[PDB]
UniProtKB/Swiss-Prot annotation, chain B:
<comment type="function">
    <text>Required for maintenance of chromosomal stability. Promotes accurate and efficient pairing of homologs during meiosis. Involved in the repair of DNA double-strand breaks, both by homologous recombination and single-strand annealing. The FANCI-FANCD2 complex binds and scans double-stranded DNA (dsDNA) for DNA damage; this complex stalls at DNA junctions between double-stranded DNA and single-stranded DNA. May participate in S phase and G2 phase checkpoint activation upon DNA damage.</text>
</comment>
<comment type="subunit">
    <text>Homodimer; cannot be ubiquitinated and does not bind DNA. Part of a FANCI-FANCD2 heterodimeric complex that binds and scans dsDNA for DNA damage. Interacts directly with FANCE and FANCI. Interacts with USP1 and MEN1. The ubiquitinated form specifically interacts with BRCA1 and BLM. Both the nonubiquitinated and the monoubiquitinated forms interact with BRCA2; this interaction is mediated by phosphorylated FANCG and the complex also includes XCCR3. The ubiquitinated form specifically interacts with MTMR15/FAN1 (via UBZ-type zinc finger), leading to recruit MTMR15/FAN1 to sites of DNA damage.</text>
</comment>
<protein>
    <recommendedName>
        <fullName>Fanconi anemia group D2 protein</fullName>
    </recommendedName>
</protein>
<feature type="cross-link" description="Glycyl lysine isopeptide (Lys-Gly) (interchain with G-Cter in ubiquitin)">
    <location>
        <position position="146"/>
    </location>
</feature>
<comment type="similarity">
    <text>Belongs to the Fanconi anemia protein FANCD2 family.</text>
</comment>
Length: 476, 683
């Protein structure tokens, strides 16, 4: 039945193939079903023959093309073919999907929406046709009536994103929109829906979704996406804390969301700045409730970006001072205690970061250490060589210390770098008061000295400087 | 330094990777290619000698560099990528994952960069052991699919190039199924677009010649390509084609050794007019030629009808009668001569390697046809200096965009280098008793070739060293004969003293000397490895006076070479050739006492008559004189005494000639002489 179509297709166009095309009027379905049963390349050959034989200047071919479109779209998913013929089918349809008027492509997109909403699209490879159709509608300056093709595209995509997405096919739906030429509002609706979806998904299917969101965010919508991911994970952490009043899953999620946002910010030096501005506490004097165990985990992984290191750390430092100024003022003062609801303080958040940190969070901890030593370096004592200089400095330094001890309990690979950094500030200075450092060191060591017979050399080289040290230093 | 650093002190440095890269990122972001190359070496050895973690950080950083990127940085980074994969693919394979995620970002990248990028990714992909992760293969198929499926040529080209390039890589028969499906889809997509079909054919042709692999998939396609060519353009030879042309359309510029009442003719003007397919004819024939040469091993018994074939053309004649009617027809004529020239250049590309003497004669007849149509075309472009047909070459120029000097190089089909095997044929001097114009064409081409390359797709994929290596064979010991015949011509042209034969041979001499200058002023002779090829060249040029002096000392070869070369200064008919001869002698004598020869020779050129034809004195234009006098006055033994000589001859310009006792010294050229004089006085 095929070889005659090949032979009529071999020589010439729109003379014989059209006239044979008006012989076999019905069942393109059985043809392609037996064809995929035998061999897909024969089906590709037939498809080329029909599409060249049924041009879209004439209108009879268009309905055969429409029916074969519905046929192949359903069979590529429901009919389990071989991968390669599937690919050839879709490549072909994608290619010939240009030559059309508006309303035929409009009804194809309506078929896709109405399928993907309710029709369990068993795989979903057919949705790859969807963007090209809308692409054609963007470029089809043949006027429709229902309007421009782009306005039909607006309506259709709005109806798609407002309509229900299946839980398993938001990745594919989103990955399709990487390519469609979206304006601000379109991509805003896209991300609004995609963010909406998170809650109704397995946790292990959140990391890649976010990934695709951010490579999409690079079009328009960064502030929205990040505020969103912050919001969702903050709520997860709060839920977990109130239920505790799972860690392995929640943690590996937050800890790979952050990796993925970091990667994007390397690839995009502006994502970071909008992140920080959105999250900057020091707007006037005010502590914002954007900041969170996750909000902070993210920053301390970000701090290993060269461009932001300084700026992130300086933000954190100033935020922590502000924290303590606030807390001092509150505690001295009942008038404020009556009014304000007790918000967690940044100190506490960071420490809590450290507990969650325990598992698998090398990228956060390596920022932590730097942070803490910045705290100690900055707010070690100086004024002997009061309220304002003591408590939010003492507590800053001893925050440093608390951090680095807590980490030194559990993160056994940033030992010898706490240790070496401690010693580095021990030995040479002897001019700036260094009381806090030995106190720290004492706690550190007492807690597990057995972990310094794994980092021992670092001690014996400070013994060579023991001759040169002031006396209180050495005994202690 | 860095080499020995990382080769000896690795055991130290391994500890301190982080620092290296916090450096290397800072190095590339700046300019100054030597900086950026240093950063490259950092990344390379960093990945070479350290551990895994470092390797990962390397690749990640490179990804960052590409993606965020600007052009220099990008390119370097891609080169580095290539280095990393060719150095250690096995290690690179497990970090291929981050490499793949680049493809999410293509908005920024240029098609050249894209070519390298897909090369890398595919070359990594079809390692045999990581078909487990054929993932990347599928995603690349996906992105190919999406780009090809676009109206926008900017995307079309990307998809095309990616697909073809991928296909070349996998062909070191499921592979055959993939490549066939791929290329058939590409062919179908490109069928719509003339500037896209051309790119497909051209890029596919060059890519196929370069890879030289998967011949089966090539035996598959050639059976399609021969048929589509011989049905698409080849028509029965009817001297009048169908179509209402305001032009007497014949089967013009036939060789006429074939039967005039024949089958195979090629329809051109009705195709380009019905378009306003024929734009693809040159590259498509190129593709057919390459495929049949790969199949039949250089056997062109099927095609040689095409070297003989007449072309269905209008009368492309010097249309001084068709003057002052500028319209869509003048673009038609300029484009038609453009297309027929591209066609003939592709024919001479095709049949130059073939050694049958009848075919060589046919090629020479095509060469004279070419030069005739070239002079007609540059005249037609002199008629209207704005009718440019924008049809560039595709490696760089087409992505760059999307009069006679533009077309000669960039617009026309670029010839091979084996085409200069044609200049073997001896000169037959029509005045005194391979013609003069068929050699003028090749030399004018070869000049633009070596100037472009040493100081253009097909040439530029070959290194400079191999290019100069093969030009050393196909110029010097074969163009010496033509040089000597030219010496004998111009000796009689000097002895007697019609215009056009002397003017053409003068321009041939000028071009020959410019070729020698470009050849020997190659900056790859500063490197110590390349001096043997120069040593062979000067052995040849010394052997042009006397033979027997084999394995000579260097300064002896210089002395013999310059002793041969100087004595052409009496045969030089114009000034450009003199300037190029003196600078040639400079750059050959720069290897060595020598000051005196150049000084002596420049004075001879300044003392010479130089017959004052108007165009002849226009070739003694002010900047040329300025350059020559700066050469003379700088290279002389004593600058001040030379200035006293010039200020002893520059003052009698007023008294006698209202043209002096030291000619090429008038009041017009006095300005430049004065300026260079005071400039060299300052120096």
């Amino acid at each position: 039945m095929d070889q005659k179509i090949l032979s009529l297709a071999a020589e010439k166009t729109a003379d014989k193939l059209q006239e044979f095309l008006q012989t076999l009027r019905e069942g393109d379905l059985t043809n392609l079903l037996q064809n995929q049963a035998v061999k897909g390349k024969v089906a590709g050959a037939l498809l080329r023959a029909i599409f060249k034989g049924s041009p879209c200047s004439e209108e009879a071919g268009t309905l055969r093309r429409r029916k074969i479109y519905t046929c192949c779209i359903q069979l590529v998913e429901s009919g389990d073919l071989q991968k390669e013929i599937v690919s050839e089918i879709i490549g072909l349809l994608m290619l010939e999907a240009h030559h059309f008027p508006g309303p035929l492509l409009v009804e194809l997109a309506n078929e896709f929406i109405s399928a993907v909403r309710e029709g369990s699209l068993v795989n979903g490879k057919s949705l790859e046709l969807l963007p090209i159709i809308l692409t054609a509608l963007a470029t089809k300056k043949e006027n429709l009536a229902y309007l421009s093709g782009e306005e039909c595209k607006k309506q259709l995509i709005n109806t798609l994103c407002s309509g229900r997405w299946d839980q398993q096919y938001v990745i594919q739906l989103t990955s399709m929109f990487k390519d469609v030429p979206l304006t601000a509002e379109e991509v805003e609706f896209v991300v609004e829906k995609a963010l909406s979806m998170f809650s109704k998904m397995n946790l292990q299917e959140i990391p890649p979704l976010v990934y695709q969101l951010l490579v999409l965010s690079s079009k328009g919508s960064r502030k929205s996406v990040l505020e969103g991911i912050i919001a969702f994970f903050s709520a997860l952490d709060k839920q977990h804390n109130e239920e505790q009043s799972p860690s392995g899953e929640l943690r590996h999620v937050e800890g790979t969301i952050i990796l993925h946002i970091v990667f994007a910010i390397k690839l995009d030096y502006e994502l970071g700045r909008e992140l920080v501005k959105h999250l900057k506490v020091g707007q006037q004097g005010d502590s914002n409730n954007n900041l969170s165990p996750f909000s902070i985990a993210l920053l301390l992984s970000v701090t290993r970006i060269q461009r932001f290191q300084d700026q992130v750390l300086d933000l954190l430092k100033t935020s922590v001072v502000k924290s303590f100024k606030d807390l001092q003022l509150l505690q001295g003062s009942k008038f404020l205690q009556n009014l304000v609801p007790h918000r967690s303080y940044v100190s506490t958040m960071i420490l809590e970061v450290v507990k969650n940190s325990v598992h698998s969070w090398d990228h956060v901890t390596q920022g932590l250490v730097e942070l803490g030593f910045i705290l100690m370096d900055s707010y070690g004592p100086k004024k002997v060589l009061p309220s304002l200089s003591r408590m939010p400095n003492q507590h800053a330094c001893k925050l440093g210390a608390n951090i680095l001890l807590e980490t030194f309990k559990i993160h056994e690979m940033i030992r010898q770098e706490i240790l070496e950094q401690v010693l580095n500030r021990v030995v040479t200075r002897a001019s700036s008061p260094i009381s806090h450092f030995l106190d720290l060191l004492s706690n550190i060591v007492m807690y597990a000295p057995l972990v310094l017979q794994s980092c021992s050399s670092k001690v014996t080289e400070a013994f060579d400087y023991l001759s040169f040290l002031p006396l209180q230093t050495v005994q202690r | 330094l860095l080499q020995s650093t990382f080769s000896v002190h690795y055991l130290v440095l391994k500890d301190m990777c982080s620092s290296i890269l916090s450096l290397a990122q800072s190095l590339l972001h700046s300019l100054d290619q030597s900086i950026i190359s240093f950063g490259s070496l950092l990344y390379k050895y960093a990945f070479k000698f350290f551990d895994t973690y470092c390797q990962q950080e390397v690749v990640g950083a490179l990804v960052t560099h590409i993606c965020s990127g600007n052009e220099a940085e990008v390119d370097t980074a891609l080169d580095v990528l290539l280095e990393l994969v060719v150095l250690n693919p096995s290690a690179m394979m497990m970090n291929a994952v981050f490499v793949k995620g680049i493809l999410d970002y293509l908005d920024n990248i240029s098609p050249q960069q894209i070519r390298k990028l897909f090369y890398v990714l595919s070359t990594l992909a079809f390692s045999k052991q990581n078909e487990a992760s054929s993932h990347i293969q599928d995603d690349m198929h996906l992105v190919i699919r999406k780009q090809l499926s676009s109206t926008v040529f900017k995307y079309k080209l990307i998809g095309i190039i990616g697909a073809v390039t991928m296909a070349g890589i996998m062909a070191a028969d499921e592979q055959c199924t993939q490549v066939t499906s791929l290329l058939q889809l590409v062919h179908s997509c490109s069928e719509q677009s003339p500037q896209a079909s051309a790119l497909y054919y051209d890029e596919f042709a060059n890519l196929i010649q370069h890879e030289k692999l998967d011949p089966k998939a090539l035996e598959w396609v050639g059976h399609t390509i021969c048929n589509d060519f011989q049905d698409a353009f080849v028509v029965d030879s009817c001297v009048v084609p169908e179509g209402d042309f305001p032009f007497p359309v014949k089967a013009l510029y036939g060789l006429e050794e074939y039967d005039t009442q024949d089958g195979i003719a090629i329809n051109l003007l009705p195709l380009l007019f019905s378009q306003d397919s024929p734009l693809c004819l040159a590259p498509y024939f190129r593709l057919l030629r390459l495929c049949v040469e790969r199949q039949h091993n250089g056997n062109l018994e099927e095609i040689d009808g095409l070297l003989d074939c007449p072309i269905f053309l209008t009368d492309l004649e010097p249309g001084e009668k068709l003057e002052s009617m500028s319209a869509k027809e003048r673009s038609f004529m300029c484009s038609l001569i453009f297309l027929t020239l591209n066609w003939f250049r592709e024919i001479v590309n095709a049949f130059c390697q073939e050694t049958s003497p009848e075919m060589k004669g046919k090629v020479l007849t095509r060469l004279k046809h070419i030069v005739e149509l070239q002079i007609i075309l540059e005249k037609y472009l002199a008629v209207t200096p704005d009718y440019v047909p924008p049809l560039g070459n595709f490696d760089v120029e087409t992505l760059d965009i999307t009069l006679l000097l533009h077309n000669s190089h960039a617009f026309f089909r670029e010839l091979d280098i084996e085409v200069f095997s044609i200049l073997h044929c001896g000169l037959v001097t029509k005045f005194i008793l391979l013609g003069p114009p068929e050699l003028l064409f090749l030399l004018e081409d070869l000049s633009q070739k070596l100037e472009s390359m040493l100081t253009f797709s097909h040439l530029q994929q070959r290194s400079a060293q191999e290019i100069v290596h093969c030009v050393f064979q196909l110029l010097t010991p074969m163009c010496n004969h033509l040089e000597n015949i030219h010496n004998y011509f111009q000796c009689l042209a000097a002895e007697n003293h019609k215009v056009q034969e002397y003017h053409i041979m003068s321009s041939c001499y000028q071009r020959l000397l410019q070729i020698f200058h470009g050849l020997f002023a190659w900056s790859g002779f500063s490197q110590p490895e390349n001096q043997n090829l120069l040593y062979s060249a000067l052995h040849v040029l010394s052997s042009r006076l006397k033979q027997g002096e084999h394995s000579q000392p260097l300064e002896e070869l210089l002395s013999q070479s310059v002793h041969y070369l100087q004595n052409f200064h009496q045969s030089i008919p114009s000034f450009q050739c003199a300037l190029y001869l003196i600078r040639l002698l400079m750059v050959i004598l720069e290897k060595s006492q020598n000051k005196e020869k150049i000084a002596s020779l420049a004075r001879q050129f300044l003392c010479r008559v130089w017959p004052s034809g108007d165009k002849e004195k226009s070739n003694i234009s002010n900047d040329q004189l300025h350059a020559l006098l700066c050469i003379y006055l700088e290279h002389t033994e004593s600058i001040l005494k030379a200035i006293e000589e010039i200020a002893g001859v520059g003052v009698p310009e007023l008294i006698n000639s209202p043209s002096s006792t030291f000619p090429t010294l008038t009041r017009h050229t006095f300005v430049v002489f004065f300026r260079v004089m005071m400039a060299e006085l300052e120096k």
